[PDB]
From a paper:
Mutations in the LRRK2 gene, which encodes the leucine-rich repeat kinase 2 (LRRK2) protein, are among the most frequent genetic causes of late-onset PD and account for ~5% of familial and ~1% of sporadic cases. Most LRRK2-related PD mutations, such as G2019S (Gly2019→Ser), have increased kinase activity. Previous studies have suggested an emerging “Rab29–LRRK2–Rabs” cascade for LRRK2 signaling, in which GTP-bound Rab29 (Rab29•GTP) facilitates LRRK2 membrane recruitment and activation, then activated LRRK2 phosphorylates Rab GTPases, including Rab29 itself.
We determined cryo–electron microscopy (cryo-EM) structures of the Rab29–LRRK2 complex, reconstituted by mixing LRRK2, Rab29EM, GTP analog (GppNHp), adenosine triphosphate (ATP), and Mg2+. We thus introduced three point mutations (Q67L, T71A, and S72A) to Rab29 (Rab29EM) to maximize the opportunity of capturing the active Rab29•GTP–LRRK2 complex (where Q is glutamine, L is leucine, T is threonine, A is alanine, and S is serine). T71A and S72A prevent Rab29 phosphorylation, and Q67L abolishes GTPase activity and enhances the interaction between Rab29 and LRRK2 (26). The observation of LRRK2 dimers both in the presence and absence of Rab29 suggests that COR-B–mediated dimerization of LRRK2 could occur under physiological settings.
Residue numbers in the entry:
A (entry chain C): 12 to 101, 113 to 167, 172 to 175, 177, 179 to 181, 183 to 207, 209 to 325, 344 to 513, ...
B (entry chain A): 5 to 176
Write the structure that this text describes.
C-alpha cells in the first residue's frame, strides 16, 4: 500500500533515466486514479513528487512522455488532494506557460495543458501571476486556436482585467479568432456560453461598440444563439440579455434587429422569471428599446413587470429597472390606462410601486424611477387621483424629500409628482400647512435648478387656491 | 393594581376608532368616520386574582402624518401598537414610517424598545386578505413583538391579539 507509494516517490527523486522515470510516473498515475481510499492524498502534499517532474519536463523539452503524463498526474492530484491549490500558492504558472510555449504544438500535449490551466484558474489569486508572466499568455491562447474540446474557452477569467488599449487589441484579434470558434462549434452549449460571456467581458469599453457593430455581427449572432441554441437554457439567455443591456447606446436605431431583440427579450422574461438573472437587464434594455420601437406586447410587458416587482422585492435594482420600464412603456402607450388598477383582470401595480418607494428610501434612483412611473400613471388616469391621496402619498413623500435633499433630481421628481397628484382637487387648511412649508423649503434648498423651480411653482399654483380665522393663521 | 397607556397609531381611515370601540365600548363595524384629533378610551382587565389592570388607549389621529409627531403623545406611554388596513401597501409603508418614528422618539426606563404588534386590519374583505407570507418579511425584519390578523367589524381576533400584547407588556 503506502510502502509502495513511498518507494515510487523515493525513486522519483533519483532522476537517473528518463524512460524509467517516465514508466514510474505512468504507473503512479495509473495507481493514484482510484476510489479505494485517500492514500494518494496522504496529507504530505510534497512538491518533491511533482516539482522535479516539471523541472525535468521544462529542461528536457524533447521528452514527450513526461509532458504527456506529468500534466495528467498533477491534474489527478489536484482533483484528488483538497489542499493542492493551497499548496500551489502560500512558479508553477511560469512552468505551465513555458510548457505551452516551447513545445505544446501537438494536440494531445495542448489539450492537457489547457485543461490544467483551466482547473488551476478556478482557485483564484493566481491569475495575477499568470497575467504578469513573460510567455504572453494571451498570445499563447490565441495561437492555440478546430478541436471540439475547446478548452481555450477558459480564456474567460483573463478578460477580468485587460486595460483599454489591450482590450481593443483583444477585440480585433480575438474577435477574428472567436468568430471561427462560434461558427464551427455552434452545437456546443458550454462553448456558446463561454464565447457569449467573453463577448460580454470584452464589450466593457464604450469605443468598441462601433467595432462590434461594424456589420451587425454581434446582434445577429446573439439573436441566432438565443433563438436556436437555447430555447430553454437560463444561463445562455441571461448572458445574451446582459449583452443586450450593455449594447444599448445612441446607435439604438437597429430597427429590424430592434424588433427581433425586443421579441427575444419578451421570450426571456416570459420563460425565466425567478432571479435577477434576466429581469433587471431585460427590463432596462426593454424600456429603452420600447421607447425607440413604439415611435398584446404591452399587456405582456405589464404582466412581466408586475411579477418582477412581486418576486424580487428585496433587490433595489430589480424594482428600479422594472418600475422604470413600466414608466417608459406607459409614456408611449396610454391606451392601457384602464387596463391597470385594483379591479380584477388588472394588475394592482400601484400599491407595488408605492411599496418599492417606501422600501428603498435610502436610494434616490428607485424613488426617481417609481415616482416618475406613478406620476405618469396618475396623469394618464384621473380615477387614481384622491385614491393615493387617501393612501398616504403626500406627507410620506414630504418626509422623504426631507430625508433626501442633496440631489436636485429627487426634488424635481417629487415636485412633478405632487403637481400631477394634486391637480383637479381641493385640499383643506391642514393639508396646506402640511404641504406648503415643506415644498417651499425644498425649493429654497434647490434654487438654481430650473426644472425643480418650474415643478415647485406649478405645484404651488395648483395647490394654493370660523374658517376665516383658521385660514388667516 | 396597575395602570398603563397604549398608543394606537396607523394610517388614516383604517378604522382606528373601530378597534378601540370594539375592545372597550363594545362597538364594532358602524359608520366609517374621520378622526380629527386624539381620542381616549379606558379598559379594565382582571388579569389575575387581586391584580386588576387599567389601560388608557389613545388613538392617535393619522391625518397629520406629515406634521411632526410630537414626543408628548409617546411621553410616559408604556405601550404602542401600529394597525394598518390590508387593502393598501401604503398602510404598510405608513406603518414602517410609524415604526421608524417611534424607534426615534420613544424611550423606556430599561431603554429597550417597548413592545409593538402588527395588526392586519379588516381581513374579512377581498382581495388582499390572508397575504401573511408577504407580511412575514416585515414581521421578522422589523423585530416586532407580535403580528396578528384582525377584523374590526367581525371582532374575529381583537381579543386574543390584545391579550397576547398585554401579556407581553406585563412580561417586561
Amino acid at each position: 500500500d503506502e510502502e509502495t507509494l513511498k518507494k515510487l516517490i523515493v525513486r522519483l527523486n533519483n532522476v537517473q533515466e528518463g524512460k524509467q522515470i517516465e514508466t514510474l510516473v505512468q504507473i503512479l498515475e495509473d495507481l493514484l486514479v482510484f476510489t479505494y481510499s485517500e492514500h494518494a492524498s496522504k496529507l504530505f502534499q510534497g512538491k518533491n513528487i511533482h516539482v522535479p517532474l516539471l523541472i525535468v519536463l521544462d529542461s528536457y523539452m524533447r521528452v514527450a512522455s513526461v509532458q504527456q503524463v506529468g500534466w495528467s498526474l498533477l491534474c489527478k492530484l489536484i482533483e484528488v488532494c483538497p489542499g493542492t491549490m493551497q499548496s500551489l500558492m502560500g512558479g508553477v504558472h511560469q512552468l505551465i506557460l513555458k510548457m505551452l510555449t516551447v513545445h505544446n504544438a501537438s494536440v494531445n500535449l495542448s489539450v492537457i495543458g489547457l485543461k490544467t490551466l483551466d482547473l488551476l484558474l478556478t482557485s483564484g489569486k493566481i491569475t495575477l501571476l499568470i497575467l504578469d508572466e513573460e510567455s504572453d499568455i494571451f498570445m499563447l491562447i490565441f495561437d492555440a486556436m478546430a478541436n471540439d474540446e475547446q478548452l481555450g474557452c477558459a480564456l474567460h477569467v483573463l478578460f477580468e482585467r485587460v486595460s483599454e488599449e489591450q482590450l481593443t487589441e483583444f477585440v480585433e484579434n480575438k474577435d477574428y479568432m472567436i468568430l471561427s470558434a462560434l461558427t464551427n462549434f455552434k452545437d456546443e452549449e458550454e462553448i456558446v456560453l463561454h464565447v457569449l460571456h467573453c463577448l460580454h467581458s470584452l464589450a466593457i469599453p464604450c469605443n468598441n461598440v462601433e467595432v462590434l457593430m461594424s456589420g451587425n455581427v454581434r446582434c445577429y449572432n446573439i439573436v441566432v444563439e438565443a433563438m436556436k441554441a437555447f430555447p430553454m437554457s437560463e444561463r445562455i439567455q441571461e448572458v445574451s440579455c446582459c449583452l443586450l443591456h450593455r449594447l444599448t447606446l445612441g446607435n439604438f436605431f437597429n430597427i429590424l434587429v430592434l424588433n427581433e431583440v425586443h421579441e427575444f427579450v419578451v421570450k426571456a422574461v416570459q420563460q425565466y422569471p425567478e432571479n435577477a438573472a434576466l429581469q433587471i437587464s431585460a427590463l432596462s434594455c426593454l424600456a429603452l428599446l420600447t421607447e425607440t420601437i413604439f415611435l398584446e406586447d404591452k399587456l405582456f410587458w405589464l404582466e412581466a413587470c408586475y411579477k418582477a416587482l412581486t418576486w424580487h422585492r428585496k433587490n433595489k435594482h430589480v424594482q428600479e429597472a422594472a418600475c422604470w420600464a413600466l414608466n417608459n412603456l406607459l409614456m408611449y402607450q396610454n391606451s392601457l390606462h384602464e387596463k391597470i388598477g385594483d379591479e380584477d383582470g388588472h394588475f394592482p401595480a400601484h400599491r407595488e410601486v408605492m411599496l418599492s418607494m417606501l422600501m428603498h428610501s435610502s436610494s434616490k434612483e428607485v424613488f426617481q424611477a417609481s415616482a416618475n412611473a406613478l406620476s405618469t400613471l396618475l396623469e394618464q388616469n384621473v380615477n387614481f387621483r384622491k385614491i393615493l391621496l387617501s393612501k398616504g402619498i403626500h406627507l410620506n413623500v414630504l418626509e422623504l424629500m426631507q430625508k433626501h435633499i442633496h440631489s436636485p433630481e429627487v426634488a424635481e421628481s417629487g415636485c412633478k409628482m405632487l403637481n400631477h397628484l394634486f391637480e383637479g382637487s381641493n385640499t383643506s387648511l391642514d393639508i396646506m400647512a402640511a404641504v406648503v412649508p415643506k415644498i417651499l423649503t425644498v425649493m429654497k434648498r434647490h434654487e438654481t435648478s430650473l426644472p425643480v423651480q418650474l415643478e415647485a411653482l406649478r405645484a404651488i399654483l395648483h395647490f394654493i387656491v370660523e374658517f376665516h380665522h383658521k385660514l388667516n393663521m | 393594581d396597575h395602570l398603563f397607556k397604549v398608543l394606537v397609531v396607523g394610517d388614516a381611515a383604517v378604522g382606528k376608532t373601530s378597534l378601540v370601540q370594539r375592545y372597550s365600548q363594545d362597538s364594532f363595524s358602524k359608520h366609517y368616520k374621520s378622526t380629527v384629533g386624539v381620542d381616549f378610551a379606558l379598559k379594565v382587565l382582571q388579569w389575575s386574582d387581586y391584580e386588576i389592570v387599567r389601560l388608557q388607549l389613545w388613538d392617535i389621529a393619522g391625518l397629520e402624518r406629515f406634521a411632526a409627531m410630537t414626543r408628548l403623545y409617546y411621553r410616559d406611554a408604556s405601550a404602542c401598537v401600529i394597525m394598518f388596513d390590508v387593502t393598501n401597501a401604503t398602510t404598510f409603508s405608513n406603518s414602517q414610517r410609524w415604526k421608524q418614528d417611534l424607534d426615534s422618539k420613544l424611550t423606556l426606563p430599561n431603554g429597550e424598545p417597548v413592545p409593538c404588534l402588527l395588526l392586519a386590519n379588516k381581513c374579512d374583505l377581498s382581495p388582499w386578505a390572508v397575504s401573511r407570507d408577504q407580511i412575514d418579511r416585515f414581521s421578522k425584519e422589523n423585530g416586532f413583538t407580535g403580528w396578528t390578523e384582525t377584523s374590526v367589524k367581525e371582532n374575529k381576533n381583537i381579543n386574543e391579539a390584545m391579550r397576547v400584547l398585554i401579556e407581553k407588556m406585563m412580561r417586561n
